[model samples]
Target: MNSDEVQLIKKTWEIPVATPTDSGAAILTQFFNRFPSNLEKFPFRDVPLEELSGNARFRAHAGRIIRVFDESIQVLGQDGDLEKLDEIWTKIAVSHIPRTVSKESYNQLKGVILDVLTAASSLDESQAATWAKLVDHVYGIIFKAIDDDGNAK
Candidate 1:
């Protein structure tokens, strides 16, 4: 993706990530709103979606999520290096090991990320398509970290 497409993706990403926590919270809010049952993975599984924005525990995890996104997007914009992305995903996977994040969970969130960008970030059709591919690329490496049994590799 080292082309004009990447430039477009990177330029537009600045907005969503400008305030990382808010974007991260929006991502989570969208995620739970769409897949309400997925909240079982978090410590605040019992908390309602309407109440999460002000919750500290939820924000802690939300901040963590945005950090990963910000760093990964930073790399994508700086350079189109798959190796660096693998390193980033590797660390997240390791951290997720304790949380037992599964391939299914990753699959569930990828689409939500794209949807959030479109809704909140003003991603037009062309921009959304490229963003979709970048996301797929990110997850493709992650999919490698998960085995055929859907367990974390």
Candidate 2:
């Protein structure tokens, strides 16, 4: 992404981090509160969070983050086609992965956001400019965890 796109992504990611979301515990509790039961109804009910979270098939895609209306959303790109990012984001938003995930797993995946940003920041001025955008991209995908169709609340 270019400088403008990079700024957009970072701006989006900053919204959630700045809000605090009830001391941050709210995010965890909200996730757990609506999981398990939902997982039982999932097509992939037998799949564990650990297995899915660390899957090579999934990790292969990591792209830029962009801010959008108080939300940090991902602009995932893979195989040189950017359109797939939307499909991936939608899949995550509607999946059992977010609901049934353990705290450790959730935190670990969340760390991926920061780790990616930090890594990009270290790559030199050009790459560092994209840090916020990267965070926004990941955040956008992750925030889908709270869509009305996916959660109890």
Candidate 3:
């Protein structure tokens, strides 16, 4: 991503990170709505989307997930931190092995994020493209660590 794009992402993310629980919950809600099957992977699988907003477990998961993104953006903001990004993402990818989180699942989540940004009109064309590129780059490390069976290689 370009410097301008990086700045835009950092600025855009600040608002959400500031109100992590609420913003994260909204993003996760969008994910569940767009990909209902993903809900099966969570404890709140049976809970309705509307009700999930008030669910502590849901909010907690959302906060945790969003924090990952927050940290990632922080790393990306630093110059000469490409290796650091790889290490961070690799660790995250390996941790998902026991849960059987597939690369495909990550891609689906990427799509959900793009959809959310689009719906909110939060990002312009350039910003959206940069966000997609950033996701692809980070997930590339993640996908490389896991085999098709979702096991860490």
Candidate 4:
């Protein structure tokens, strides 16, 4: 990744954990500051299918991937047929960021995703591994992009 790409990733990591009651738009604005025009790319795939849009945290996570890719592609001028690739890259990055979440924050969001998934699964009868895969996916991307400055905190 180039400096701008790295900076965008860094910014995502730098976002401190906030309550669900906080302004979604404000959080989204912070996201756009680093990656403008990202909303257009919503619903990036590869997440456990169940977590795609039912939960707010998953929606936020998906939104992050979209926003990062929208801006990152613009920055890289790789906007050719590579839009899909760009989204994939951002999705990969987002899956990993959670592992670096502050312990308190990790448990908080993890619980959120879990509660959401568990409730949904009760109705749908899906395995918990769906959520686990989501967590693992984010962790994989985050570990790859882990910064020495410990920005994930």
Candidate 5:
């Protein structure tokens, strides 16, 4: 991704990022609604699916989860280099190893998060298509680390 693409990402996120609690909850809502098992990885295991949307604990987790993408979007391609992203994603992968979040799950969340962003943002058709490549490349780094850094489960 280049600087132009970086700017495009930030532009698209302006709306969703502003109200991360709702957008982020929407992400986890859709996500866990399907894979309820993934929700178990967090602290809201005791909450019902319907209750999650309004639960403070659940919303808090969702808030934290979205910030990862927020932070990544801010710095990615900022220097027009991969070194920083490598460091970021590598650390992210290592931190989640104990949680046993797989590359497949990481890949799944990218699309799930994209669903929220695409629905809530103002991306044009062309930018929407380009956003696909953006998330792929972004998650691609984390996927690689999930494999190489930990050698997978």
Candidate 6:
């Protein structure tokens, strides 16, 4: 990622990842709202959004996801971290095997996240583009570990 992209991601993620209770939950809620089908694979998939929002499990999972992104973002500009990022993304990909999360689903999730970032952050067109590039780079590694059947390759 470019300097501007790194700067924007750092700025945007700093608040949310730190206060996962609000921003992280909002992001996950928006994600599920936009792609309900993706939630079908989860244990609380059928739960009402209002209830799910307050559910501890849901909150914990959302926090975990944000934390992963937080850590990954920190390493984005670091030297010798590509392999570390690859490992992180690979583990995440493997975990999704049982859920049958396809590349399309991942891409959809990317859109949801981008939307959240755009709306939540002060990201302009240039910053949004930068964020998209970062997402592509991260998701590309993740998708490589997942096959058509959503199994780990």
The candidate that achieves the highest lDDT relative to the unseen native structure: 6
Q: Which stretches of candidate 1 lie over 4 Å from their true place?
A: 77-80, 148-150
Question: Residue 68 of candidate 1: its Cα lDDT?
Answer: 81
Candidate 6 residue runs with Cα over 4 Å from true position: none
Model 6 gets an lDDT of: 0.81
Lowest lDDT sum, 10 consecutive residues, model 3, at 113-122
**Candidate 1 — worst ten consecutive residues by lDDT sum?**
144-153
Alpha-carbon RMSD to native, per candidate: 2.0, 11.9, 1.9, 15.7, 2.4, 1.6
Lowest summed lDDT across 10 adjacent residues in model 2 is found at 60-69
Per-residue lDDT for 70-143 in model 1, tens only? 78877774554678888998776666666666777778799888888887678889889988988888778777
Residue runs of model 3 more than 4 Å from their true location after superposition: 118-121
TM-score of each: 0.87, 0.34, 0.88, 0.31, 0.86, 0.90
Candidate 3 lDDT over residue span 1-153, tens digit each: 778878887887776678778777777887788788778988788887779888989978878988888888898758776888898889898788888977677777888877665545477887778778888898888989888768877
Task: Please count the clashing residue pairs in each candidate, in the order shown.
Answer: 0, 14, 0, 5, 0, 0
lDDT of 2 at 7: 57
Q: What does candidate 5's lDDT look like per residue over 1-153, in tens digits?
A: 667887888788788889988888889888888677677788778888877788988878778877877887777666644777678777877788888887667766777877777888966777887788777776767677666334453
- Residue pairs with colliding backbones in model 5 are none
lDDT for each residue of candidate 6 in 1-153, tens digit (9 for 90 to 100): 666667778887775566766767887888788788888988988789779899988988887888788888888778867888898888888888888898888877888888877877767898789888888888888878878768778
Question: Which sections of candidate 4 miss by over 4 Å?
Answer: 1-104, 123-126, 147-153
* lDDT of predicted model 2: 0.43
Error in Å for residue 46 of model 1: 2.3
Instruction: Record all residue pairs in model 1 with backbone atoms less than 3 Å apart, i.e. clashing.
Output: none
- Candidate ranking under lDDT, highest first, comes to 6, 3, 1, 5, 2, 4
Q: Which is superior by lDDT, 1 or 4?
A: 1
The alpha-carbon deviation from the true structure for residue 146 of candidate 5, after best TM-score superposition, in angstroms, is 2.3
